[PDB]
Symmetry: D3
Subunit: 71 residues, 6 copies
């Protein structure tokens, strides 16, 4: 249901910062962790932000593309 709470997807190097509606970070964090993509080392969620730690910037770009493709 990413499109229902997704707000913005930014990034730097091997890191992606996914911004969601208030209080929905952990909901997508659950989604992300359940994908278990090899490119994602791990995810950490606060209240409206999800930090996706990827192996490399290239894996980040890849994850970013697959994520935006779900909207």
């Amino acid at each position: 249901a990413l499109v229902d709470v997704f707000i913005k997807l930014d990034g730097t190097g091997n890191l992606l910062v996914l911004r969601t509606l208030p209080g929905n970070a952990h909901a997508i964090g659950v989604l992300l962790d359940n994908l278990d993509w090899d490119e994602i080392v791990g995810t950490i969620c606060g209240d409206d932000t999800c930090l996706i730690i990827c192996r490399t910037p290239k894996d980040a770009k890849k994850v970013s593309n697959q994520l935006l493709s779900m909207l």
Copy 2:
């Protein structure tokens, strides 16, 4: 929204305990706080549980019915 994460709605006296999918408590906590129902004194969310503190058991029954009606 609610129907997509709702799992169970229980209660005792003036208290309602809303159970949601893992990591979705704060998402509905935002929904509940946004409704600003006079019956709801306040809400506190953990990871998958939302505690809705109502003024009286009567107000709780009322809130429970309006909540279930959105399912």
Copy 3:
């Protein structure tokens, strides 16, 4: 400190619901727990709401008074 984030103090029976600025519930929760008032059985904080569980409605009124006196 409290006056800097305090927004509203409500209650029912032996329960008090303290509303704070977004993300400041746990800051006050720390304050409350550090007071160790005999009247307060315990505190549970979400994002902007603090549930203060008091022993009796009378202890709740007492706690409410002391809290508002710090504003």
Copy 4:
């Protein structure tokens, strides 16, 4: 592993307040939710406090006894 993080168990009416070591509330919240005791309506965890909402004070006393028996 309750005994490893348990600090104190208090209560009022149908409510129980379980105090744990810092950051361990959700760990026991998981334990409590997995028990699915009929007496427990629900649980809400903060950082070091777990609020156990029981149906009645009698169910609270019962839950309290079973919990302390695990230490």
Copy 5:
């Protein structure tokens, strides 16, 4: 506000790690997110630590400077 809870500001590359008083991470996280500085890609808060993800190490030094200037 920041000076009231600020404890330490560290960093590595494009990342800044802001340490605050216990339970005050999200309070500052709200402050940071409200500044919407172009240098900050995003923020993630735990209990007493705020991770500020900046675009580059240079933007991190900049953000660090502006932050410490508010003390």
Copy 6:
């Protein structure tokens, strides 16, 4: 302690991602912060993931080895 909730330890560069049982991230976050290892700049915990920000990938390898040695 750690062995009782530890699930996986991954990493990239100066970052380590520790995965724990659901709801146990902050319990080990407390453990990590209590160690005050010079290698660890800081830690941020969500629900089941702990992000350990180390100064360099070398420090991360070091921290990773001492962590796994406690298993």
